Amino acid sequence: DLAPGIADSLRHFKVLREKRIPPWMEVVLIPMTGKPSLYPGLFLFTTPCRLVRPVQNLALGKE
Amino acid sequence: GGLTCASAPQGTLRILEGPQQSLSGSPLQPIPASPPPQIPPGLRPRFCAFG
C-alpha cells in the first residue's frame, strides 16, 4: 500500500529535477494481482543504454 | 551484570517522509490540439485566359 505513492513521488522528483533522481530514471511498478501477470515489483532503472522518449506529463505539464 | 533478553516489543512504528497530491488541472499543451491549415484572406486569381 506504499508502492503506488512511492512510484508517484519518484516520478514527480524526476519530472521537476528534485533530489538527485536522474531526469531519465524509469520508475516501473508492475502491479500484482492473483492472475499470472508479469512478476510483480517496483523496478528503477537508470542505466546508460535504454531508449527514452518525451511525453507531456499532464497534471504537471513538465515534459 | 550481563545483558539479558527483555520483554518482547508490543508494537512497531515505521516512519517515512511523504508529500501530498495537488488539484487535477491537466494542462495538456502550450498552444494545444493540431491547429488546422487554412485559407490566406482574399488570395485573388494569379492567372488569366488569353483573349
UniProtKB/Swiss-Prot annotation, chain A:
Subcellular location, record wording: Nucleus, Nucleolus; Chromosome
Coiled-coil boundaries: none
Transmembrane segments: none
Superkingdom of origin organism: Eukaryota
Family, similarity comment: Belongs to the RNA polymerase beta chain family.
UniProt note: domains: The active site comprises the fork loops, the loops and the rudder that stabilize the transcription bubble and assist polymerase translocation.
Subunit record text: Component of the RNA polymerase I (Pol I) complex consisting of 13 subunits: a ten-subunit catalytic core composed of POLR1A/RPA1, POLR1B/RPA2, POLR1C/RPAC1, POLR1D/RPAC2, POLR1H/RPA12, POLR2E/RPABC1, POLR2F/RPABC2, POLR2H/RPABC3, POLR2K/RPABC4 and POLR2L/RPABC5; a mobile stalk subunit POLR1F/RPA43 protruding from the core and additional subunits homologous to general transcription factors POLR1E/RPA49 and POLR1G/RPA34. Part of Pol I pre-initiation complex (PIC), in which Pol I core assembles with RRN3 and promoter-bound UTBF and SL1/TIF-IB complex.
Functional note: Catalytic core component of RNA polymerase I (Pol I), a DNA-dependent RNA polymerase which synthesizes ribosomal RNA precursors using the four ribonucleoside triphosphates as substrates. Transcribes 47S pre-rRNAs from multicopy rRNA gene clusters, giving rise to 5.8S, 18S and 28S ribosomal RNAs. Pol I-mediated transcription cycle proceeds through transcription initiation, transcription elongation and transcription termination stages.
Pathology linked to this chain's protein: Treacher Collins syndrome 4: A form of Treacher Collins syndrome, a disorder of craniofacial development. Treacher Collins syndrome is characterized by a combination of bilateral downward slanting of the palpebral fissures, colobomas of the lower eyelids with a paucity of eyelashes medial to the defect, hypoplasia of the facial bones, cleft palate, malformation of the external ears, atresia of the external auditory canals, and bilateral conductive hearing loss. TCS4 inheritance pattern is autosomal dominant.
Protein name: DNA-directed RNA polymerase I subunit RPA2
The encoding gene: POLR1B
Curated annotation (Swiss-Prot), chain B:
Residues bearing the modification Phosphoserine: S26, S34
Annotated region described as Disordered, given as residue ranges: 18-41
Compartment(s) of residence: Nucleus, Nucleolus; Chromosome
Extent of Pro residues compositional bias: 29-41
Note: It is in an antisense orientation to and overlaps the gene of the DNA repair enzyme ERCC1. This gene overlap is conserved in mouse, suggesting an important biological function.
Function: Component of RNA polymerase I (Pol I), a DNA-dependent RNA polymerase which synthesizes ribosomal RNA precursors using the four ribonucleoside triphosphates as substrates. Involved in UBTF-activated transcription, presumably at a step following PIC formation.
Known partners and oligomeric status: Component of the RNA polymerase I (Pol I) complex consisting of 13 subunits: a ten-subunit catalytic core composed of POLR1A/RPA1, POLR1B/RPA2, POLR1C/RPAC1, POLR1D/RPAC2, POLR1H/RPA12, POLR2E/RPABC1, POLR2F/RPABC2, POLR2H/RPABC3, POLR2K/RPABC4 and POLR2L/RPABC5; a mobile stalk subunit POLR1F/RPA43 protruding from the core and additional subunits homologous to general transcription factors POLR1E/RPA49 and POLR1G/RPA34. Forms a heterodimer with POLR1E/RPA49. Part of Pol I pre-initiation complex (PIC), in which Pol I core assembles with RRN3 and promoter-bound UTBF and SL1/TIF-IB complex.
Protein family (similarity comment): Belongs to the eukaryotic RPA34 RNA polymerase subunit family.
The protein, known as: DNA-directed RNA polymerase I subunit RPA34
